[PDB]
Design a protein around this ligand. Structure first.
Ligand SMILES: *[C@@H]1CC(=O)N(CC)C1=O
Ligand SMILES: *[C@@H]1CC(=O)N(CC)C1=O
Ligand SMILES: [Cl-]
Ligand SMILES: [Cl-]
Ligand SMILES: [Cl-]
Ligand SMILES: [Cl-]
Ligand SMILES: [Cl-]
Ligand SMILES: [Cl-]
Ligand SMILES: [Cl-]
Ligand SMILES: [Cl-]
Ligand SMILES: [Cl-]
Ligand SMILES: [Cl-]
Ligand SMILES: [Cl-]
Ligand SMILES: [Cl-]
Ligand SMILES: [Cl-]
Ligand SMILES: [Cl-]
Ligand SMILES: [K+]
Ligand SMILES: [Mg+2]
Lengths: 225, 243, 225, 240, 196, 238, 227, 228, 5, 4
């Protein structure tokens, strides 16, 4: 009856409103930005012991210097992740340099709101945390289905983000080390998760000025827990 | 019996009785103009007469017309919605010019009328546009058949006539004209300009000033479509008075 | 052409057309997949007399090294299967290697996802179980659903009474059950016998390391029952 | 249920309500008038001041669509501006093809047919604007046309559009415009705007004046500031 | 140029091709393979313009394989030969013509062995034996001289060896090694390379 | 316009396709049509829904269409839709013959048309075709074959089946009487009359076509009125 | 733009209501009659001569498609003109390829195909017309009907429009196969006379014949003689 | 109800509800202020994690402040940037500010008249300098645009407008420092009584006679706040 | 329904 | 109906 590009009397796009609600169906992801690097942590949310935990990928590499945590409708995110990967490589090709975390986030958010009436029929029902290191140092950005993006010191997305964000604002400080940030987000994930946190039901990744995007192995997760 | 289902009153789909309501409503739109037009043909000429209402003194009355040259040899009178009318006039002019270009002779009046009617048919079958709320009457001389009067409607119907009318007093005009042909020998009009003015005066009960009507003519001796001046119309109104 | 947005967000962040597609899956016959040590097994429930059994099969080869089973709209399935078959050949053409089970899964999933965000189209009303072996001889089992989400499983079920079969497999999928090829096939038959109340109305297929798909005869299935 | 949602829908009595609703948007606008006199055409607009923050000259309602053609608008101003562009493009294209200045009557007809095209379809909505076109040349003399949202086009001796149209016409009818010069007419235009202005309801307005005639050598121009101020003073003192 | 040869016997087809890839004055590869497996019992041998040969042959390959996956059974040699011809003839007057010369060799369960000859214009002929390349000019008459329809696989190989020896003797190009394959009811068999 | 769009290609809350289901309703009100496979051929038996006295009968058949050299079909549903689809079947068959220079295998022809029907249920926002088809044929892969397709683009192979009016009652009679692997054409003919006898008897009211092999060549023939009137007489004795 | 969705869809009971409503437009149309004789076909129709002001010779209901094929209709006149134009075009496209006049059956099939399109294509309603097509090829007469759905039937004799049900049973009584063309014209006029009332003249009926010499409308003089 | 879902539907009162609803979107944005002297044009914006960008560079002589849908804002900013590039490419001179605004109005009007399209849910303040001196323009979802002495849009901007009217008689003769402070004071009116302008929440853009459009953030806005 | 499995 |  009503179109996808309709405004509400309050001046909001209905479809975008509903897409933001779908983020709340997603598992919790956390990002913290320190002077020593950025860390990303996500709840896997295993639904069955028969399911392979390593086939749940909610932190992905964009480039050597940029990672991405996602929450919401995961199938929607794959097309956004590809756009980010292609765009970083396009920038390298043309300019022979690394694309900044901000520029990558900006490029991905250009896709949003580009729906209407076999083109995109609806917005993407996913939120993204972009964490990486460029010449401005370590940086974390948040983007939601509306296409709004912003730099964050610490951010949580997903079902339990409101509570997790409260925890983050208490523990975070600007002079905080990366090792502290890793521990902080694991403690927060622990309390907001339904299941008991172990080495198989969470993901953790860091990007540092020193080294490339690093996904924590099983053994490395056990050490941290 | 006047039944309806779904969107049969909003778009041109069939009703349970097999009617097109949107087409019927387009005929009602013709009457929103509040004007009546009359056309009659004889052996020698064809004539169109219409009302000219200029209620505003601030109007330039010379720009108020329902008579249109389509070609040198084809005139028409438009009844109904004004902007719809002008659009159909432009289309007629286009079809006539294109015909001449492609075929190397002037379009017959019957063919131009058929073409406009065929275009109107499309609007009765495709849901996304509305029919035009107007009616076109064409006059011209045919080399073999003599003077011609043709009319097409928003339904995409068309026909040639001895005489016809359009607008508010269409039915009353048809009654008047029917009663007059049944008296003439060989069912044919003789004094054609006088017949058209008299018919329109009777059904409206006016009795016109020369500024209150428009008259267009084509004749066998003068095929070029001609619009009568105010003085030319007066000489007809004065003659119809002094008998 | 037709450009109506068919899959749209509703209040609460629901994609109704996708959820309705998932209902179409539940109306489908049960399909079970188990990944063994050096074997992968698919089994499907069958709905008759006078019918040619060969024509109506729910187990299909995508390539020499990949096959799949489906539940839901059978016409939609044929379309997805033939799309995947074309893609398997395009991959062999461009990379000169057979597809990994994961690659073709990812392809099928992204196809399904596109039909949830494209104008003028409804989603595919099928789930798929995709099995096979990789280059290094690792057995694989993946599941796709209408939303375009995919995951790897040790064992899984889709279609009518999938939830009951899944709960059976959770209690039964052990090392002892997948220790041999005979016990791996047995576990699938047992899983099916849990919802089919039958044994003569089941179709079963086996795939071994670089040995291609082998569909079992009714006489060979009667031996297990 | 309703017969008033689409321009591709007739009502049972043969009306197109979407066009009528667009005309209502014109009727809610403030008044513009055009008067054709002996040697040209003069336009005046009651331009409502919605904010003191705006510059004197903001939201012009008088446009040049060709060097010899002016346009005065009432209604939704964004729609009016786009129609000004249509008219400009039409005048431009005519010169390119035919090699002379577009006759005013032809321009009116062409733009009107564009306006009309927006009254047929569910795919688009009618323009919520009426406008006047004015021109002068030695060959054609002074000409004033008015087009409404339905796409109807007529020529006038005097014309008014907007909310005080009927009241403006009453005043215009009192003039023997045919015998008067543009200099006299600008004063009368200023006067009529001050008369029809509802001082109680709408508080502040700027008077906008333009003309085209023998005195401008057939070029459409804004009325000079000094002449405009004289007309404002005359209109103000007349309202005494 | 590149050399192709086929010899159809009663229940088999024998095929051979040179193993040289040349560029200007140098041999760049001496173990080149000009044969493409279409199915279990079909080989396509393809020579001609660089790029065109592998692009065309691999396109046919993937389409013949797709047919099998879609239908559960394979194209017959005759169906595959006509499919190949259709594609090549369709491209003849297009923006993308393929300058390739082909042999298609196959065994059908019902029809027996088959050998097809196709030139770049896409004329298709069934032949008991055929050859492509400049080498064909020196070898076709040896085949005409010695071939009989009932020739055994043993004799076919020696008759092939006669043709190849003629190239060594009389042909101006250095073609020292040849791929040899046979197709029968049991599929495609790799024979020993014939070397000089 | 979103107002006037009936949205023919969407899911219901139960995961159902309403237009497809309504199309199958249409078919259930169409003339009875059945096919029977035998060891030496296949047959189609159709109820003529053109049984008016003033009809001319200008064609050799009214409901049975030849598709290629080795295949025929019969239809139940909207006649005009059937004309579109049967034309398309002929085109697909010829496109295959052009490409491969061999006749299209029966299942390949069925799959190709079903893909078209499936497309109408998934995109384009059009009404589906209201047609079920029975296909009979012979190919070198599977010999004599009988297929059925429905509006969604599903198909299946059958030894015997029925579409159209009273098809449920017909399929019951087939299950009882059909001797799997032991049917000849003469006994299949008999069973067809017997099934049409219950679900509907006159020779003007039925139409029978047979497909056989003679000298390595397919023969498709519509039985003459004399042959049908003799088959009706042979049953009434039983 | 144009609507891309169908305006004809299946109802829960399996009906296409727009087609049924189209048939209601046909049944409400002026009566038409077709009779196939041994050596010809005749088409006859009523002209709703609602006035003496009409020029009855200005438009025709009985129309030539080719030299050997003619048609008439019941239902909506403007819809008929569309199909007349398409039929003429289809007949020429055939002739250009085959250099042979199109067989009547081939013309009917192609025209019926066009009528099918408007029951499925986007943003259009079906035609509110049924056609009677007559033709002569292979030394044999043909009479076809094509309905709004695109279904076609070969008739020995039929009627359409108002009171077609009564017309059909009238024909069933007064038709034998051996009847020749002269007699067929007589009985076709009588069929229209069953549901006329209004004093039949040669101005308010139209008759077309089709034989070996081809298709032509009967002249007003010829019609006057049969009356 | 039935008159408020489509931008192509006129209401009986001669209104288009979708356009009005789109205008509400800009009211939900945070406040921004623009004002000019005879030499400079200034933009000041309140920023609502880092504080969200509100001021965007368009060309050396043009900058914008945004209120409403961020995505529509970038779509419009990109169009504007392109128009400026095109002008310099073709004519080797800056695009006059008034000509750009006309191009914006023409562009944003198109979707207000076409079915299935929606208005731009963004309002712009445009600061520029050209041959005709400094400029402040305002653009609306309605596709209307205004030439301003000063303006404010966004939430609680009504009180910023009140300040501007009170003081606009002295704007023309202000030096740059006084003009920026006027803008800051106006923006401060929008804030709750307890809340204050900080270096975290204030963004300033300046263009003038001898100054290319420059954006001041964070540490760069300290000199402007110190004078208050 | 017969169009699932 | 006649269209079946
Ligand atoms: C034109 C000629 C004729 O007789 N008709 C039917 C009333 C027309 O419309
Ligand atoms: C004019 C246009 C605009 O965006 N606004 C704010 C709601 C206006 O007042
Ligand atoms: Cl969130
Ligand atoms: Cl007379
Ligand atoms: Cl796709
Ligand atoms: Cl499931
Ligand atoms: Cl007005
Ligand atoms: Cl054939
Ligand atoms: Cl064939
Ligand atoms: Cl549409
Ligand atoms: Cl024609
Ligand atoms: Cl012809
Ligand atoms: Cl004739
Ligand atoms: Cl946004
Ligand atoms: Cl506004
Ligand atoms: Cl605001
Ligand atoms: K229409
Ligand atoms: Mg080339």
């Amino acid at each position: 009856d009503r179109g996808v590009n309709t405004f509400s009397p309050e001046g909001r796009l209905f479809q975008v409103e509903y897409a933001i609600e779908a983020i709340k169906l997603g598992s919790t992801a956390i990002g913290i930005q320190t002077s020593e690097g950025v860390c990303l942590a996500v709840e896997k949310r295993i639904t069955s012991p028969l399911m392979e935990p390593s086939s749940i990928e909610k932190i992905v590499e964009i480039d050597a210097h940029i990672g991405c945590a996602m929450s919401g409708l995961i199938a929607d995110a794959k097309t956004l992740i590809d756009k980010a990967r292609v765009e970083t490589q396009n920038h390298w090709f043309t300019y022979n340099e690394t694309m900044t975390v901000e520029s990558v986030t900006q490029a991905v958010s250009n896709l949003a709101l580009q729906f209407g009436e076999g083109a995109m029929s609806r917005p993407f029902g996913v939120a993204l945390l972009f964490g990486g290191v460029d010449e401005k140092g370590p940086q974390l950005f948040h983007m939601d289905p509306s296409g709004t993006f912003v730099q964050c010191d610490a951010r949580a997305i997903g079902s339990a983000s409101e509570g997790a964000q409260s925890s983050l604002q208490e523990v975070y400080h600007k002079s905080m080390t990366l090792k502290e940030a890793i521990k902080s987000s694991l403690i927060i994930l622990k309390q907001v998760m339904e299941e008991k946190l172990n080495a198989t039901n969470i993901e953790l990744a860091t990007v540092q000025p020193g080294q490339n995007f690093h996904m924590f192995t099983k053994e490395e997760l056990e050490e941290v827990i | 019996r006047g039944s309806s289902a779904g969107f049969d009153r909003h778009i041109t789909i069939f009703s349970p009785e097999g009617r097109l309501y949107q087409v019927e409503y387009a005929f009602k739109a013709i009457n929103q103009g509040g004007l009546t037009s009359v056309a009659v043909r004889g052996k020698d000429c064809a004539v169109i007469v219409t009302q000219k209402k200029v209620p505003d003194k601030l109007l330039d009355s010379s720009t108020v017309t329902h008579l249109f040259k389509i070609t040198e040899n084809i005139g028409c009178v438009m009844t109904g919605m004004t902007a719809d009318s002008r659009s159909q006039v432009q289309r007629a002019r286009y079809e006539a010019a294109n015909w001449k270009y492609k075929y190397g002779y002037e379009i017959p009046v019957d063919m131009l009328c058929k073409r406009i009617a065929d275009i109107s048919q499309v609007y009765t079958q495709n849901a996304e546009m509305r029919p035009l709320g107007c009616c076109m009457i064409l006059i011209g001389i045919d080399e073999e058949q003599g003077p011609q009067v043709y009319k097409c409607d928003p339904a995409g119907y068309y026909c040639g006539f001895k005489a016809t009318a359009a607008g508010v007093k269409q039915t009353e005009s048809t009654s008047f004209l029917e009663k007059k042909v049944k008296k003439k020998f060989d069912w044919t009009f003789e004094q054609t300009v006088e017949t058209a003015i008299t018919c329109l005066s009777t059904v409206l009960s006016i009795d016109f000033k020369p500024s209150e009507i428009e008259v267009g003519v084509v004749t066998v001796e003068n095929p070029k479509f001609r619009i009568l001046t105010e003085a030319e119309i007066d000489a007809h109104l004065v003659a119809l008075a002094e008998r | 052409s037709y450009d109506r947005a068919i899959t749209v967000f509703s209040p609460d962040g629901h994609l109704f057309q996708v959820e309705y597609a998932q209902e179409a899956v539940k109306k489908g016959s049960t399909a079970v997949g188990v990944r063994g040590r050096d074997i992968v097994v698919l089994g499907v429930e069958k709905k008759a007399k006078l019918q040619d059994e060969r024509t109506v099969r729910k187990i299909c080869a995508l390539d020499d090294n990949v096959c799949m089973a489906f539940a839901g709209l059978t016409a939609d399935a044929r379309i997805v299967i033939n799309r995947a078959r074309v893609e398997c050949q395009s991959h062999r053409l461009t990379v000169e290697d057979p597809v990994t089970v994961e690659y073709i899964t990812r392809y099928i999933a992204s196809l399904k996802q596109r039909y949830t965000q494209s104008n003028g189209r409804r989603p595919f009303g099928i789930s798929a179980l995709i099995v096979g072996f990789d280059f290094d001889g690792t057995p694989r089992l993946y599941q796709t659903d209408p939303s375009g989400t995919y995951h790897a499983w040790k064992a899984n079920a889709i279609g009518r009474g999938a939830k009951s079969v899944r709960e059976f497999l959770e209690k039964n999928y052990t090392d002892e059950a997948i220790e041999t090829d005979d016990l791996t096939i047995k576990l699938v038959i047992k899983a099916l016998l849990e919802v089919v109340q039958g044994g003569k109305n089941i179709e079963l297929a086996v795939m071994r390391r670089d040995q291609s798909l082998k569909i079992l005869n009714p006489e060979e299935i009667e031996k297990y029952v | 249920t309703g017969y008033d949602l689409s321009a591709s829908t007739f009502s049972p009595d043969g009306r197109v309500f979407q066009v009528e609703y667009a005309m209502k948007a014109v009727e809610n606008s403030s008044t513009a008038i055009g008067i054709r006199c002996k040697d040209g055409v003069v336009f005046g607009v009651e331009k409502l001041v919605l904010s003191k923050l705006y510059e004197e000259g903001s939201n012009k309602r008088l446009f040049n669509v060709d060097r010899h053609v002016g346009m005065a608008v009432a209604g939704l101003l964004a729609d009016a501006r786009s129609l000004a562009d249509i008219a400009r493009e039409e005048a431009s294209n005519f010169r390119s093809n035919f090699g002379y200045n577009i006759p005013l009557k032809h321009l009116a007809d062409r733009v009107a047919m564009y306006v009309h095209a927006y009254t047929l379809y569910s795919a688009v909505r009618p323009f919520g604007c009426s406008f006047m076109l004015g021109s002068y040349s030695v060959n054609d003399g002074a000409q004033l046309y008015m087009i409404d949202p339905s796409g109807v086009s007529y020529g006038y001796w005097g014309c008014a559009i907007g909310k005080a149209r009927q009241a403006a016409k009453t005043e215009i009818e009192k003039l023997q415009m045919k015998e008067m010069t543009c200099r006299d007419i600008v004063k009368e235009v200023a006067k009529i705007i001050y008369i029809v202005h509802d001082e109680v309801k709408d508080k502040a307005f700027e008077l906008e004046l333009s003309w085209v005639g023998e005195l401008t050598n057939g070029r459409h121009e804004i009325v000079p500031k000094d002449i405009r101020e004289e007309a404002e003073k005359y209109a103000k003192e007349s309202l005494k | 140029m590149e050399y192709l040869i086929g010899i159809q016997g009663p229940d088999y087809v024998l095929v051979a091709s040179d193993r040289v890839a040349a560029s200007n004055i140098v041999q760049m590869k001496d173990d080149h393979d000009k044969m493409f497996k279409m199915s279990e019992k079909i080989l396509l041998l393809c020579v001609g313009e660089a790029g065109d040969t592998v692009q065309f042959a691999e396109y046919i390959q993937k389409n013949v394989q797709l047919y099998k996956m879609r239908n559960g059974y394979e194209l017959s040699p005759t169906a595959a030969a006509n499919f190949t011809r259709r594609n090549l003839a369709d491209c003849l007057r297009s923006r993308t013509p393929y300058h390739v010369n082909l042999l298609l060799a196959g065994y059908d369960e019902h029809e027996g062995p088959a050998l097809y000859y196709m030139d770049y214009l896409a004329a298709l002929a069934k032949a008991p034996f055929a050859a492509h390349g400049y080498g064909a000019f020196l070898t076709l008459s040896i085949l005409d001289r010695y071939y009989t329809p009932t020739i055994s696989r043993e004799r076919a190989v020696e008759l092939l060896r006669k043709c190849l020896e003629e190239l060594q003797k009389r042909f101006i190009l250095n073609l020292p090694t040849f791929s040899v394959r046979i197709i029968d009811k049991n599929g495609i068999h790799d024979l020993d390379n014939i070397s000089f | 316009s979103r107002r006037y769009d009936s949205r023919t290609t969407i899911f219901s809350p139960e995961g159902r396709l309403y237009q497809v289901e309504y199309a199958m309703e249409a078919i259930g009100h169409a003339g009875t049509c059945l096919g029977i496979l035998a060891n030496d051929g296949v047959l189609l038996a159709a109820e003529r829904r053109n049984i008016h006295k003033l009809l001319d009968e200008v064609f050799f058949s009214e409901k049975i269409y030849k598709l290629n050299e080795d295949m025929a079909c019969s239809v139940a549903g909207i006649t005009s839709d059937a004309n579109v689809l049967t034309n398309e079947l002929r085109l697909i068959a010829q496109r295959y013959l052009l490409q491969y220079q061999e006749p299209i295998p029966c299942e390949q022809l069925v799959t190709a048309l079903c893909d078209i029907k499936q497309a109408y249920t998934q995109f384009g926002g059009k009404r589906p075709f209201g047609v079920s088809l029975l296909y009979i044929g012979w190919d070198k892969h599977y010999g004599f074959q009988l297929y059925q397709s429905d509006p969604s683009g599903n198909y299946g192979g059958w030894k015997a089946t029925c579409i159209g009016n009273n098809s449920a009652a017909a399929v019951s009679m087939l299950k009882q009487d059909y001797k799997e692997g032991e049917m000849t054409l003469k006994s299949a003919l008999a069973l067809a009359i017997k099934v049409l006898n219950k679900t509907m008897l006159s020779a003007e009211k039925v139409e029978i076509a047979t497909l056989t092999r003679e000298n390595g060549k397919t023969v498709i023939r519509v039985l003459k009125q004399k042959e049908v009137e003799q088959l009706i007489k042979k049953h009434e004795e039983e | 733009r144009g609507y891309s969705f169908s305006l004809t869809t299946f109802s829960p009971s399996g009906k296409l209501v727009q087609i049924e409503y189209a048939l209601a437009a046909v049944a409400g149309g002026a009566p038409s009659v077709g009779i196939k004789a041994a050596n010809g076909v005749v088409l006859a129709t009523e002209k709703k001569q609602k006035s003496i002001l009409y020029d009855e010779r200005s438009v025709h209901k009985v129309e030539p498609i080719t030299k050997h094929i003619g048609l008439v209709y019941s239902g909506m006149g403007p819809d008929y003109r569309v199909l007349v134009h398409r039929a003429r075009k289809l007949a020429q496209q055939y002739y250009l390829v085959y250099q042979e006049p199109i067989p009547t059956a081939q013309l009917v099939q192609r025209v019926a195909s066009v009528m099918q399109e408007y029951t499925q294509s986007g943003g259009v309603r079906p035609f509110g017309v049924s056609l009677l097509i007559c033709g002569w090829n292979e030394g044999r007469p043909y009479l076809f009907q094509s309905d709004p759905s695109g279904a076609y039937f070969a008739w020995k004799a039929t009627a359409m429009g108002k009171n077609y049900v009564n017309g059909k049973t009238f024909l069933e009584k007064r038709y034998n196969e051996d009847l020749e063309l002269e007699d067929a014209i007589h009985t076709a006029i009588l069929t229209l006379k069953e549901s006329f009332e209004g004093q039949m003249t040669e101005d308010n009926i139209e008759v077309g014949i089709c034989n070996e010499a081809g298709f032509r409308r009967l002249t007003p003089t010829e019609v006057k003689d049969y009356l | 109800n039935q008159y408020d879902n489509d931008v192509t539907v006129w209401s009986p009162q001669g209104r288009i509800h979708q356009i009005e609803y789109a205008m509400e979107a800009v009211k939900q944005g945070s406040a921004t202020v623009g004002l000019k002297s005879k030499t400079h044009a200034v933009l000041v914006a309140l920023k609502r994690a880092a504080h969200q960008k509100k001021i965007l560079h368009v060309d050396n002589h043009i900058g914008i402040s945004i209120a409403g849908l961020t995505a529509d804002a970038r779509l419009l900013c990109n169009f504007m940037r392109q128009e400026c590039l095109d002008s310099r490419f073709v004519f080797d001179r800056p695009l006059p500010v008034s000509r750009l605004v006309s191009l914006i109005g023409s562009k944003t009007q198109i979707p207000t008249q076409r079915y299935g399209r929606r208005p731009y849910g963004v309002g712009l303040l445009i600061a520029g300098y050209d041959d005709m001196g400094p400029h402040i323009f305002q653009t609306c979802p309605s596709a209307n645009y205004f030439d301003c002495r000063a303006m404010s849009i966004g939430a609680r901007s009504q009180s910023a407008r009140t300040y501007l009217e009170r003081h606009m008689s002295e704007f023309m003769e202000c030096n740059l420092n006084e003009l920026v402070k006027h803008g800051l004071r106006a923006l401060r009116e929008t804030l709750p009584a307890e809340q204050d302008l900080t270096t975290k929440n204030v963004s300033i853009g300046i263009v003038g006679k001898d100054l290319e459009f420059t954006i001041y953030d964070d540490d760069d806005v300290s000199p402007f706040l110190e004078g208050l | 329904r017969s169009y699932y499995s």
